[PDB]
Amino acid sequence: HMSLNTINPTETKAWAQLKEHFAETDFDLKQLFTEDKSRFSEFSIQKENLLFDFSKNLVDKKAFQLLLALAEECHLNDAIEKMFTGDLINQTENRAVLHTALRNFGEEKIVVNGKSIDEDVQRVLNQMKIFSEKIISGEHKGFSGKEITDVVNIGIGGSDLGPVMVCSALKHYRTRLNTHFVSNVDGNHIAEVVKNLNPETTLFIIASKTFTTQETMTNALSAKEWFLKAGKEEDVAKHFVALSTNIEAVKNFGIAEENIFEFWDWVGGRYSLWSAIGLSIVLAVGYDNFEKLLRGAQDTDKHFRNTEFKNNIPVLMGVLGVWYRNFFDASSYAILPYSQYLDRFAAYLQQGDMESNGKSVDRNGEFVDYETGPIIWGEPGTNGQHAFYQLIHQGTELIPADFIAYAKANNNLSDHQDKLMSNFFAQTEALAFGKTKEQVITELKASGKNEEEIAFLTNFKTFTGNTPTNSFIFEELTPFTLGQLIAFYEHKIFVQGVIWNIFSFDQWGVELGKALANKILPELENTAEITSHDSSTNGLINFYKKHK
Template sequence: KTMKLLVNLAKAAGVKEYAKKMFSGEKINWTEKRAVLHIALRNRSNKPIYVDGKDVMPEINTVLEKMKIFSLKLRSGGWKGATGQKIESVVNIGIGGSDLGPKMACEALKYYSDGPAVYFVSNIDGADMYETLKLVEPETTLFIVASKTFTTQETITNANTAKDWLIAKLGKEAVSKHFVALSTNEKKAREFGIDPANMFEFWDFVGGRYSLWSAIGLSIACSVGFERFEQLLQGAHEMDNHFLNAPYEENIPVLLALLGVWYNNFFDAQSYAILPYSQYLSKFPSYLQQGDMESNGKTVDIEGKRVNYQTGPIIWGEPGTNGQHSFYQLIHQGTKFVPSDFIGIIKPPESIGDHHEKLMSNFFAQTEALAFGLDKEKVIEELKKQGLNDEEIKLLAPYKVFEGNKPTNSILLDELTPKTLGALIAMYEHKVFTQGVIWRINSFDQMGVELGKKLANVILPELKEKTPGEHDGSTNGLIGKFILCSVFLVFLLGFTGCITIGRDFQTKSIPNIVIGKTSMNDIMNVYGNPYRKGIDDEDLTWTYLNYKVSVFSGSCTRDLYIKFDKKGLVKNYTYNTNFPNEEVVPKP
């Protein structure tokens, strides 16, 4: 009865009608006025799909053919680096969908990898690129820069670092032989040093989290070969047809979506666990985090009104059996209600001893335990068999009870192949789509990621110039702490110890402050915005952090405190010089 009601909900929401709109190229991403056609990238039937009256399939096929030629040339050794050596390592530089999708797929299909070693760099934290460059050689490495606009901060920062590293080893002329671009910005790519012939296009109807089927999947083709990449597309295409044509009652993505809605909106499940019992699928949960949470983490409906119900859940998970030894305790006996998807492989790519039987015995045991639990009577019976007395049993029994009735979906793949992986990914894509339709939200924009980016662009120059701007007290305090701790640069000497060199916080000289004459504007013109503004004994007080001292193996900081009268003129001021390492240094 429940499933029948849920199916009626899907019908009432018009899931099938919206699916047809997506597959026909209508602009269902209404906030950005874009079609949603990642399904066209894997349209193996090659039937025309139109956007604004233009069939997009010819352009898609052109890019796929270009990917095929390039990957074949690279894998066969036909593509040479600047020194004439074969490419042995590929480093994909991207972030978000330009990283998570291909990284997950390359890991999932590692068994089939017979091409160059593929690495992924996404984090703007320099450690990511630094540790990767330690693993590769410039003469035999190709960098794939994946950025539609070729302006993404993290990606371009990492790409420039990689380019500097390459130029230092091989010279500037080597760039065109060791970099390709997945982008639509030919001008920027050319300025970077990439030959336009080595650019691979994709389109605004392909969202980042759905882009592994596009040129973004070039690293996959380089790793496992283009023929297997096509099998990946084929598996997704077959799932597309199933989703579009199967009745609601037999439609796998729809049924998964409805169960998710049931748990989310009727049982108040705040999170959803993805538990693949396959090490090859170890990156699948993090991939689905973006696919689900960036899609359905929304609060505004199609009419621009705030929803009064729950939308997308928190997605998380780890491969089995690792998770059993960390968070399964909470799922079994915690106070949180956590539905879970268990994903297993019947016949693994590899077979070592009885590893797989032991792995899958845990899979089946966990789903059984979550479903049926262990009641108090059985617990008491087991404790009696262990020889415990009545008092011990009374004390221990409550802790041994498993309530059960914890919902799980068991998803079994016959094998983990490029084709079944494609179907698995597409299944979850359509599940997310279905839930978005039911919740009446736009699953294809991601405006929630923009505000932080804008604020970071404001804060970056403040960190570089060592000048906190006008933020809330907490943010200014954190920025000030960062500046305080990072202003001293440590250089290792060749044979003894180190020396610490301080940098001026302000480049301008300290003004001659005159009590009763120097104004707030005078101070601002020299120092800029204060680190902190506050009230001290009813007087307005500004605090500046000033760094003026170089000392051996130590550091010295100087703080300036200024009080102003009601006219905005300096009432008094004091300096406080600190020597954290207790160095005896005269005041500057």
């Protein structure tokens, strides 16, 4: 069952010479730079208002061209077109993978089961546009005749993370509407969210692709019950909308068909904010800004699709991460956005990347014996510098990172941006080159320490450097540039998926937790000593019954 080609990466001629080049070459950033005054010019891409500098990576020309060779030898070009043109590359679920079509604005006709999809895509977009104008303008009144003031999106993972992150990121572009985000099945979540809300002016969005997810549906029914303390059941259709592929199950909720915002099974959850799932974003910043978001993604789309690999930003991002993950044995990749607007960006890439490539079986049905998806993590700068950058600078862990920044602040205050930016430049410079023993002894003598102090202290103040980083400079955080930046990583994950020879678009690994939880749920509701599992699950459960 093959669509995408199934070339095992550890078998290519490129992987061989990469294994050989790594084995016989020290990659010392300070060296690579001292040897070559043009290193930055050679190892960066300046696409219009965007600088992607990959020169602080642990690569020389040879490793660089060999990693390009590997993507070519894994037939990456073939894979790109299979995705964009709608081949059923999600083979285990027999699905196409067409989040790119969600933002192509009808410039391409993609056919799925003999059906052009762009009519469908633009219909829902225009549907989100007309709906949202009526909420924002205040033409769409709640049941007592008041304007909606508050929008509560309800969903989990793919139905939560993207709307959260984007709305958080584009807070400068906000409408009048307040947005709120219920996700956890923990009832304290919706309880705290609605606590100061008014059901006369609150609009609920039930985002669930399947519309069967336990967390979402429980939150939906709590939102309904909460709403029904003030409203009538015939009023549900005025305050509840749904974003799903499951129009039948939605309609049973009391949500009107007209307010079902459809998307499709070739839109993965973690790639869905571009679709109907983006509606909370539509209401949060208006549709014009949402189109600007989809346009930024399409520009990355076009760039990834047509640009030769040496100049292809997501391809470089992808092959560089394979380098660190499989050759430098690095288990993690840090995501360090120097902007408080990107406070939920690392969290979003956690699902997009790790749920996509957290696999250990190849497209052939075979267990892999090489590492696949890494651990994605981070916090914004400069905040991270005061949490975990100590470990990056001086721990035992090799942690490659992406440092993401903007030349311009949407809110420019005194010297804030230049100070922010001064850290952005310094931390990748410090991570790359460190500070040597002689550099340390010099600062210590100048500090007036006696040789005994100097002796004891030198190693604790040394930085061996040699942490690799990518640096992104966009000009300004807008919907467009955010659309670019998200789609860069989307295509990073695709690239790495193609090379690693896995399926980036299924998620069979969630099923066992779901099943075991369905067995335990009724067990917690009765009053019996539970003995049906292992001794730990038995103990945890019975302890909970005595203290619930």
